[PDB]
Amino acid sequence: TSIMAVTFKDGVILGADSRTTTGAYIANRVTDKLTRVHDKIWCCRSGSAADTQAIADIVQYHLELYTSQYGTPSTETAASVFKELCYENKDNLTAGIIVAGYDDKNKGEVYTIPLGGSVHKLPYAIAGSGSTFIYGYCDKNFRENMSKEETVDFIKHSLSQAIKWDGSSGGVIRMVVLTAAGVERLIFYPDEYEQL
Amino acid sequence: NNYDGDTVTFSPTGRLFQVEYALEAIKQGSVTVGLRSNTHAVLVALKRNADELSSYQKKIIKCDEHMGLSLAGLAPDARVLSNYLRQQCNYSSLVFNRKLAVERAGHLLCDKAQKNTQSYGGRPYGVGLLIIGYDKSGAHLLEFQPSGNVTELYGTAIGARSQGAKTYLERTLDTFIKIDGNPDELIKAGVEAISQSLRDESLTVDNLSIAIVGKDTPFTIYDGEAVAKYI
């Protein structure tokens, strides 16, 4: 698994691969690891597929109830719900989550919740196995308030390198762009990012 | 008339008759006065007996080295509330290394009493309390009623014929509020106040109880000959 979320001038962009393996076998090569918990609040999931799916479902339920009672939730609110769900059940969960949201108050925001249930707000976050191989590249190539094109290119290059070096990551590169316009879905196929 | 069956029923005028009956239970109790200055706080208690062979019961209860209370009314309800206050002071001292303030003690007894004036089956408490204490804010005297209302005062008195002592404390306010550094004069002022509520009685060594708390004086109770010098 290789997931990331990058903020930029117009909003945020989540990116992930599509490879879910049970050991050395690619159980699914078209996995959607980008999950929507609210209209403009999504999450990149890594780790236990069952744990992450259940956590995302419960967070979506809580955010729907929150929207029904007190109106639209903030990205920090979704991050807090994720943090509570992951910290109070840290003994029986293996889930790394990257919560990326867009609101008109704070533009784009990215929080990361690794193992243990700690929450960290970052300009960009990476997680999963393949992330181990792109720390240097991302740290040397990330810039604040990039344009949409440069952010898509950065995420594409990072995830392509991760897929190239990490055996646990592969498939197509999925992206979800959260901006004032709304939600845009992007896909990049192997024949494109492999020649990068 | 048809609205004094329990605490769960309001009267057409908006009254809680069980609370008022508890207050009346207090009014039939023996008188006890409390006063304070800027350095000390005194509780004087007129202990009541059944006959000459009986004891005079006990009206002063210590809750912690810095806080104590005198009762007027049902003794078991006063024991329950004093045990709750001891447990809260102990919890504060253990968990926070912090002596429990007197205002918060009044708030907690207010909540404990209010929890009975709204649930069916649980009667209100039939006792009134006078709580003296000395904390980081100085000396404090509180009057607690079973309605839940807790009031911080310089002086007051509760029980039968307490209005005389209350008026005496009203007249002597400017005098006893300045009795700082001399606890014996404050105790004698409290003794005069409780004497103002003696119609056909007189203070002896068996009916007078004293309690003192202050700066360098932990909450101490005086019974018997110890109070004789103040009679």
Partner: protein, 241 residues
């Protein structure tokens, strides 16, 4: 004696507490009607702000239960908000457990079952409110379903609720007998809002300003409530006729 205090059967086989809750539904003295269009559903209710010290934006008897279901309540606002919170919780739990948005009739049946529980249990009183849920169900189209303190629930082509409910009901019955259809043959939801407001003016015989009405519109995957300015624009468009 005591048979009229708790929810038990009288010698006539009646539940007087249920009837008294029905009476309490009219305590607010506000009427509201609901009608269906080609692909939407409109509810209109009277907005009465008697005190000058009140915030008019907070005076509302319409609630956004989910993104697709709206609910207008006739009755006291405590029980109204109680039922609204319960319906929102039930819709959220439904979406979580069964993976799809709760249908309008299903929420109506749940609230009516809870009302039946309150009617058969003596420890709790029935909620003196009448709940009208409206939505555009993915399998039923525009849907209006009403529930009452007795535990009854039923759908409508159109409906009305309040003290002057019978007049609006008769007006809608006459319009639908003449038009020979069970909805409003209009494409845009604005025209259905205008139709509802116009027919309420005709039935009640009173004019309305932008600060006298509350309008809730349900379209495919979206329930919303009109602001004072949208209500004013609809009133201007009705005046253009």
């Amino acid at each position: 004696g005591y048979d009229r205090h708790i929810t038990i059967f009288s010698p006539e086989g009646r539940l007087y507490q249920v009837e008294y809750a029905f009476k309490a539904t009219n305590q607010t003295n506000i009427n509201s009607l609901a009608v269906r269009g080609k692909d939407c559903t409109v509810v209109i209710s009277q907005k009465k702000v008697p005190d000058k010290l009140l915030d008019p934006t907070t005076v509302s008897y319409i609630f956004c239960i989910s993104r697709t279901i709206g609910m207008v309540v006739n009755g006291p606002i405590p029980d109204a908000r109680n039922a609204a919170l319960r319906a929102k919780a039930e819709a959220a739990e439904f979406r979580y457990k069964y993976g799809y948005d709760m249908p309008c009739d299903v929420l109506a049946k749940r609230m009516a079952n809870l009302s039946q529980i309150y009617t058969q249990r003596a420890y709790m009183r029935p909620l003196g409110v009448i709940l009208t849920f409206v939505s555009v169900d993915e399998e039923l189209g525009p849907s209006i379903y009403k529930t009452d303190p007795a535990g009854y629930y039923v759908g409508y082509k159109a409906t009305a609720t309040g003290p002057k409910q019978q007049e609006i009901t008769t007006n809608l019955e006459n319009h639908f007998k003449k038009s020979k259809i069970d909805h409003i043959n209009e494409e845009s939801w604005e025209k259905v809002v205008e139709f509802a407001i116009t027919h309420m003016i005709d039935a009640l015989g009173t004019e309305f300003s932008k600060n006298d009405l509350e309008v809730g519109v349900a379209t495919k995957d979206k329930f919303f409530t009109l602001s004072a300015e949208n209500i004013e624009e609809r009133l201007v468009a009705i005046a253009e006729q």
